[PDB]
Amino acid sequence: RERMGHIELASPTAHIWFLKSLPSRIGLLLDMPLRDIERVLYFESYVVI
Amino acid sequence: PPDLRPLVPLDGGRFATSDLNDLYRRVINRNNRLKRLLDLAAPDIIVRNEKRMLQEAVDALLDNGRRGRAITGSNKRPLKSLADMIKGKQGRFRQNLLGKRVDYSGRSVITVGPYLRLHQCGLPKKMALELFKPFIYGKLELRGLATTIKAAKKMVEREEAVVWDILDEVIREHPVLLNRAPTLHRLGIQAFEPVLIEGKAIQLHPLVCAAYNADFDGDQMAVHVPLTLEAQLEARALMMSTNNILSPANGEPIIVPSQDVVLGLYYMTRDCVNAKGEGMVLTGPKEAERLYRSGLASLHARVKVRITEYEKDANGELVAKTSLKDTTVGRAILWMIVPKGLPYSIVNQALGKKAISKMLNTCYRILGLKPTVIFADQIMYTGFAYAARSGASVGIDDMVIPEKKHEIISEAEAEVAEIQEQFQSGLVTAGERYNKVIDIWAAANDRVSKAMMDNLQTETVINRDGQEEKQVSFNSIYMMADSGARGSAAQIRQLAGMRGLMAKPDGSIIETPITANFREGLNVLQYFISTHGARKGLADTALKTANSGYLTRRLVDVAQDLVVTEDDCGTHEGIMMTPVIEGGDV
Amino acid sequence: VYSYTEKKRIRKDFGKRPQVLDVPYLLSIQLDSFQKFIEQDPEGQYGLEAAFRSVFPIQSYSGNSELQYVSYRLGEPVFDVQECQIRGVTYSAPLRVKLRLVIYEREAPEGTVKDIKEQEVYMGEIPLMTDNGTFVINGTERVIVSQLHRSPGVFFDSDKGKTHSSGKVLYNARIIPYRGSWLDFEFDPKDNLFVRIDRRRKLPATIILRALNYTTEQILDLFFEKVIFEIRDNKLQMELVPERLRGETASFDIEANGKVYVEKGRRITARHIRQLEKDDVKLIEVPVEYIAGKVVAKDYIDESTGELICAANMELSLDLLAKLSQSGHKRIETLFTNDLDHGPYISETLRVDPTNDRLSALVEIYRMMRPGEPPTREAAESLFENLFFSEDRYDLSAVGRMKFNRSLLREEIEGSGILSKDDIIDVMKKLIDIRNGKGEVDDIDHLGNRRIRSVGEMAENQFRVGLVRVERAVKERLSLGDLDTLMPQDMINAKPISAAVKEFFGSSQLSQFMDQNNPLSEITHKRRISALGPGGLTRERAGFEVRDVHPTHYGRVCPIETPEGPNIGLINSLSVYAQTNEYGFLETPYRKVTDGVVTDEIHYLSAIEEGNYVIAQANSNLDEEGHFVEDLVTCRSKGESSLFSRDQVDYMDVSTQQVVSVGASLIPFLEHDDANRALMGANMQRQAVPTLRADKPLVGTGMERAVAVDSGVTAVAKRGGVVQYVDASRIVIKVNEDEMYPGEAGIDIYNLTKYTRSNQNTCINQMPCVSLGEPVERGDVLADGPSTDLGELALGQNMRVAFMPWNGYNFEDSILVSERVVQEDRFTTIHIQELACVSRDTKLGPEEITADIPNVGEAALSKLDESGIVYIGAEVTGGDILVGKVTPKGETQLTPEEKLLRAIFGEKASDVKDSSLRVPNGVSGTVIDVQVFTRDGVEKDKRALEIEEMQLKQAKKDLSEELQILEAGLFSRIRAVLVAGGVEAEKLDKLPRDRWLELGLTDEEKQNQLEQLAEQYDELKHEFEKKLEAKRRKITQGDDLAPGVLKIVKVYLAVKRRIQPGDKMAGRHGNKGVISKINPIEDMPYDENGTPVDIVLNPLGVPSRMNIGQILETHLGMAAKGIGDKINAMLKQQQEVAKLREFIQRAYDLGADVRQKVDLSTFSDEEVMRLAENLRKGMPIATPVFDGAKEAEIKELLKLGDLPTSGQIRLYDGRTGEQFERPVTVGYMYMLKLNHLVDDKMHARSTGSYSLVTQQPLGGKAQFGGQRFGEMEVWALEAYGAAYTLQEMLTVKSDDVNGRTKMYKNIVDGNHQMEPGMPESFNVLLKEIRSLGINIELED
DNA sequence: TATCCGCTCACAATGCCACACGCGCTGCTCGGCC
DNA sequence: CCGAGCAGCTACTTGTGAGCGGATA
Ligand SMILES: [Mg+2]
């Protein structure tokens, strides 16, 4: 009833809760519009680092 | 965790699984495919598409449908994610945390119990047996009747003659909790001492269902067991019916009598001018009751009797005074029920709904709470008995039609015809014509209602060694309406007199009223307009109950964050309360 | 003349309105719908030809290979409806379509196709409804309700009030096709017009208008008018009409012909218009600052420089004025702008239009429809041409085109399914006009705008939905098919369309098993109109407009029959005389009214045509010769009651029952009841449970004589004949000579159905009501079904009822009952429950239904048979194994020798698991029937063999009766033909001719005739043997159950449940209640004659809940009973038939000018005695819904008998034995036992199972679960004190995995102390939140 | 550049009880430690 | 073999509130 396991994810992913909070947490923390963050998340436009 | 995941072997090779199972399945699959693609060094577009698909899988597992595309797993229905198991009226909070299903509970249809006292209630034998199985087992193991749990269980299943007394003993002073299905205020759950009855229904006290807002047309209520010494003591001390007689909203007593008892008492106290034994003398209320039950005298008749009343002095003293009064036999008989503290002026009335309500209020104010319960119980008993002995009954000949209703209707139709003539003459327009027709019909309806009332009041003349002694009407429908038992003025007006005006969909008033009544035949178009107007009000409550429940939930969620934690704050600010007098006088 | 069942017991009737239109078929709607569905119709009309001719034919990708459709046929149903019910298979029929594959060679577009392949192919089976409009999908009888939705066409809604909070009324036009893409034109808070396609982005209408090859000047000429300005010598004169300047002020001196007309600053009034029209002038002088406010209409090109001077939709400035004057254009066309006549709206849409040409218009509309994917012009035009002008994605039906043409005021009512540019132009003009003020909105609150669809329409829609998938499949498969490679059978699969039809008929928002509890519920459920389901609203998102009933609902849908609760107004019932229009609307019959006479003809008016004519009052006092006794008459012009003259009226109501439903017309004295009480009574009458013995309702409505025969509940006579064989199971009738077929005919047989489980766990049984030799007519009733009596509906029972309080036992609504009712077997009902056990094919060996149950004695197995099934008739009251189901848990290959050994010697049978099915703990009764179904292949047990042998014996008895009748006829014929050899006939053919047909003499004719007769005999014998063999093979054919099951056994446990305190009983006027306490016969009150009362209601429930009609009914019933009592005094005391006939005549000739007018002298003087015997229980009285008997009629009927006229009789108390003062009323009321028996409501639990997801106690009555402590209950508890009480009710009694066991152990040990512990569900929530990316944690 | 306005998206709508029922097929392709 | 993952064959609610442009001084 209490023991849990885990999955070792190969490509680190984002948490949809912190991304679709309206206002999302990352959208305000990263001073970046949620549209660009969604564009980057769904693999259709680069973001420089 | 696995067992927490819904997965159970159904009939045959198929298993009843959960949506989270399929979610984790697809997530693991996409992760493994992505690992395989990364191991073979797939092209950049292929690995980016696999990463996008894995992101879709994981954020649908987190909260499906939030991304925009609510994917389905089976039956082409929206899939259940982890966020769905918490939100809404089906998450853990609303279904498995705040309100949970409890053991030692039962449900059954309600039923009028007229003999039980206000503090107690009825309970089916089989229900009481199934509810208190552990207490019965313990009491059987106590006595030299059952040495183990298996023997006691077998005896209970067989239901021998030796277990029924045990069940009567365990419910000697063990109260239970009665609960209505829609719970509005504190009175939605009350405590009652159960008495065993042979049947499948729950006998309920009549004076509390009114607070329950539970009619006896098929309502089903639930029963719960305290199961703990602390719980039993709390139910006997706080949740008991006797300890809840004032509503928490207003200081008005929530144990106001219902229609049957008040009708019985009104018939008992409504005095006539001439009856059997009018003008004699009686010593006390007991002699009056004897003379009445002997049949040698009527029930309501002006008689000079001698009462012995008691008045509470400044201290805890009850001074006695005997005096000759001139009252009806019914009031004298009922005087044997009221405690000594109350004066006689509270019984020397017609004893309507408001009258008995204020009587009970004064009794609770002067004598406290302990005697008020038994006073109300005796009130209800006597009311039921005398309403049964009376023979109140509504009939076709009881509802009278005003003889001058026809001439009023003809005058109204002549007025509307001359108004239509004026309109056809081009003098008055359509709006003023409609307004004049509406006000003329309203005046005619008011006149015919006043006529119906003054008619229902008259034609009650009885000769007492004279010629005519026109009195208050004794018509059964008038007794039910004027006493405020069940019928109101507007209801009896719609019944006997014309129904009046109706409404159209938008909310306006149709210019053609209903010139008929219920006793007389109703026209087809009139009944059509009536049902069209009534369906609106019918659907009103059926729609509004959901909004009311939502408002109650919102209000209690705003609430319950404060309790009385201090005895005094030590301030002086407040609010300037003044009687509002806006609009009318006050 | 009257029918035979009427001669059995004719019911007294009241009323003075002689009806002209009889009661139509109550189930005509669905019957006619399904008839329109399955039939060969030319011209591709409704049913199945429409979808075929719309989808078919199919052509490949220019491959010269077409698939043509010829016709379709429905095969014979592989199982009779009784067989489908007793088996569980569907009552369906095959669908054989004759298709034609025409494939031709290449290099020839229109080359004549050869090698045509015409082949019949089977494509799934379709369910066929029975004669009662019911579909059998899986054993049960599922019905489809009709759906009320938006009529395809155009609508104009008016957004007002809170819309946009701007105080500006907006008008939105909506074009909605029957199947395709929608269209919505709307306005902004400003004067801007926009358009959208199925709730897409809001874009202006000019782009979608110019997308159809439309230029700017064309749009401006279509929408707005033209004002002409002439380049004169000076001042740029213009043309004028005095009607265009109406409502505007004169900004200049309007003068013409050297005479001043309107001064500068004077509004042109009507007198000014008349003055300016008197002279008929057109050209005046207008200043220069006035033209600057107008705007040019068309683009004027220059001829000197070849450039554009000014484009359209641009205000003119003085420089542009000079330019256009110097260019040479004398005639300048500008727009006519006026806020009262032509509000400028297209101009704003044009100046906000980002695109000008058709190319960019199409590409922008493509981008707006599909995000991204920018195509070229020819690729984007494909979407715009396929989504609105292609007959495959736009399916405006006939009624859609009709409504579209009627709304736009067009003469022709026909058209196509696709739209057109002129239609869009007209709808935009209509929206502009309705914005300007001309024309009014069409409210969604109108039956003329709401279309009804039956089962046939939705069936055809689902057929087309499957056919589009089948078409895509056959198209993608036709990409490879060439000549001489395939027949037109392999390319078509039955999966898609058959599966679609099956899922539509089995699982949908409208397919639901009928509430088989009484004929009334059947009738009101088949005539049920819903607004839910596909294409309809949801009860959660419905406003106060759909719930409300409109005056247009008069006679088209009942306003008082509606299920109170979640869906009030959304679910309605069709009117009595309501019919379905050909287009799909609600038509109501009306009698045509001429100037002076109302002819006896009927016209079925629609909903739109109501406001055109005027309808007369239904119960209006009318004179002979179709005249009215009064000049003024109550009528209604357009949903508004009013008073008209005797000649202005044009239509009258056909009767007085067309307003109420069939379920509401059975409410006697309905006119004396309130709407709420009437609705409650009509809803509760639907839930009447058939009593053990039905009885005629005293106060009837006459309609009961139809609902009992128009439905398929009772045995109706298909052919009138003489009764031959009466039996409780079957009824054999001999057809009369005229109605008998001239060949291969015989006698009719009706197999009555016995006690079998219905769809609501109720008993349904038919009882014969005919005698031997009794001649019956065609259509007459032979056997009364459940809750019927001599072809008359009988739901509840009549009972002696008084209205007086009795010691508070009728406190608020509780009902008091005497022990006489429960002792006389009055309200005792029968409940049948079906329990199923399946032998699923699992691994480690399949299951067994043997009787070797180990780990148990013989007492629990004494009720089991040799095969392993409980006997037929073995009672059971507690948990008892009634079927021996065992399953292997370990090794397979148990040798049969060792099996029999274990059965006799050795140890027990190990791999059984004791998984046998037993009855649940709480249900009792005696099992009455057992069914079993074995898959083809598994060994049929001997009980299945016995059951099939019994059914074969029944079928063989029927066939033997048939063949013996035919053989007796043939032997009479052979006797008649061999009369020439009469001596040998009478000497050796009396006893032995039945087996010694062999004879011969005088060849020439005798041999020929004897051979012909012997041939006929042997052919008949062979045909009957073939019939018997076919029946045997049919009943022995094993049915499929499921993939992975061996056999399925079902048992029907029947229990007789009597009335007891707790049940729900109600009259017919909404006076529901619960039985308070059963009373002894001595305690109940009794009259001065000695007859005790049965029911004691509460008279206090009458005033508030205004159902006063019930009281009237009661009085009437009293009168009826009194008549009955007279008849009894005439029957017990042997009286001559003359006195009886005279009394019956006096009773039936009551002085009310009734329309019955029955005579007793026309009877046979023998059936009079039978009728009187049938009347001794009371005199059945009919009462119209609104033409019921008045008070004086009931008074004179009461005074006919010795009963008191006042209706109130002095009553004596049962306990004290004294006289009740204030004489209480008492009569005979018809009551009903509701389907809310207490035995299915009382439930409790001490400690049972718990859920697996969380350790919480279950609930419900099926499973041993408790109740739910609702959130409101928790609120009420915490509003009190009882902290310990809530803390124990939350976790100790429900959730604590280790706390409830400890508490139980303490209580059984006499310790009333608890341990808080922790709620398990709290830990479940902890683990669930921990499974997410959020960490929760408890502190110290 | 502030700031009101228009368009777009998240979230909400008793409670109980009773009954009934249900879960994309076939096929194809890739991968796992007695 | 077994198993497991995936591919071809919805729009009458209305409201309220918050956010994202957006265009105008
Ligand atoms: Mg109720």
Coordinates of N, CA and C and ligand atoms in Angstrom, one line a residue, chain B residues 180 215 217 219, ligand 1:
Chain B
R180 N -31.8 13.1 7.2 CA -32.5 13.3 5.9 C -31.4 13.3 4.8
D215 N -41.7 15.1 3.9 CA -43.0 14.6 3.7 C -43.1 13.1 3.7
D217 N -44.5 11.1 1.6 CA -44.9 10.6 0.2 C -43.9 9.6 -0.3
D219 N -40.4 9.5 1.2 CA -39.1 9.9 1.6 C -38.3 8.8 2.3
Ligands
MG1 MG -41.3 13.9 -0.5

